[PDB]
Amino acid sequence: LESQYQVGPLLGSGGSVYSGIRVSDNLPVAIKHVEKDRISDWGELPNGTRVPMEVVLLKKVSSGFSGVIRLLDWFERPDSFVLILERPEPVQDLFDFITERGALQEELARSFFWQVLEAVRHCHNCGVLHRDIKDENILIDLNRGELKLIDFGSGALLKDTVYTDFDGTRVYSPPEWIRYHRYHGRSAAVWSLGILLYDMVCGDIPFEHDEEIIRGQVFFRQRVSSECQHLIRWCLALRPSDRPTFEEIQNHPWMQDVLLPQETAEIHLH
Ligand SMILES: O=C(O)c1ccc2c(c1)nc(Nc1cccc(Cl)c1)c1ccncc12
Ligand SMILES: [Cl-]
């Protein structure tokens, strides 16, 4: 009936997301609506029910692991789908967080960035490729210091062969996409993570136009340490095969002695 939930106010659109409470528990949730007409990419659930790929991917990552948003439930309507998603409270998305705090201290960027890496690796381990990693698609559970990856609407099943379709954010896409319309999932993901790390520590993204992406020359507009500059420049190698693996990123020197999430909440967030 979908009145297991009380809909509250619109939180935004880009489908459309509203705030809600589960009626049992009063558990907080996000209610996301997606029009069938606007959905390009579809899958089949284990029972072979036709659903948006978004839902397939959410169930595949679904888990006790808190670094990826939990899909609590979903409904099909004549012309739409509705997803019941987890809502942290208090919460704030990383784009707003950075917009208001500016460039982040490296300690805090390290914790954040690490948590994002752990979430992305969990996605890849569950056979899922996000394809739209960026500040707007990351939520901060302000009390626990835990980040949550959201919005699998542009995702795909992870594969080892080449992708020739892309539907995520252009300014996070890698040079191979812009000029050949071809990428591999992991290396493109590593590129976007480089953009994101640069955004964390410089307070904005490094490239606006396609010409810039393709030239891939990185200028630091803020004071960033050499270790962090190195890691970023590596993730943003032009040649996909010169990018680090996730293991090399997490073994990188800038990335050592990460804070635990709760420490992170205590020092930077409360
Ligand atoms: O898409 C998901 O997987 C997805 C999943 C969870 C949330 C979400 C998107 N979007 C939120 N906010 C939001 C705010 C403005 C515009 C839009 Cl489109 C969404 C939000 C807020 C609080 N708790 C969970 C969520
Ligand atoms: Cl530091």
Residue numbers in the entry: 34 to 47, 50 to 305
Task: Give verbatim excerpts from the published study on this entry.
PIM1 kinase (Provirus Integration site for Moloney leukemia virus) is a member of constitutively active calcium/calmodulin-regulated serine/threonine kinase family. The A-loop of PIM1 adopts a conformation typical for the active state, a feature independent of phosphorylation as characteristic for constitutively active enzymes.
CX-4945 is positioned in a pocket formed by a hinge region, glycine-rich loop and the activation loop in an orientation almost identical to that observed in its complex with CK2α kinase (PDB ID: 3PE110). In PIM1-CX-4945 complex structure the inhibitor binds the protein through two direct hydrogen bonds, while the binding of CK2α involves three direct hydrogen bonds. The first direct hydrogen bond is comparable in both structures - the carboxylate group of CX-4945 interacts with the amino group of Lys67 at the active site of PIM1 and equivalent Lys68 in the structure of a complex with CK2α. In PIM1-CX-4945 complex the inhibitor’s carboxylate group forms a hydrogen bond with the main chain amide of Asp186 within the A-loop. The third hydrogen bond stabilizing CX-4945 at the ATP binding site of CK2α is not comparable to the interactions observed in PIM1 structure and involves interaction of a nitrogen within the tricyclic scaffold with the main chain amide group of Val116 residue at the hinge region. Because PIM1 contains Pro123 at an equivalent position, such interaction is not supported. In PIM1 a single water molecule mediates an interaction of carboxylate substituent of the inhibitor and Phe187 and Glu89, while other water molecules connect the phenylamino amine group of the inhibitor with Asp128 and Asp131 of PIM1. The only more significant difference is observed within the hinge region where the sidechain of Val126 within PIM1 provides a hydrophobic contact with the tricyclic scaffold of the inhibitor. In complex containing CX-4945 the loop is partially unstructured, though some weak electron density suggests a conformation comparable to the CX-6258 containing structure is possible.
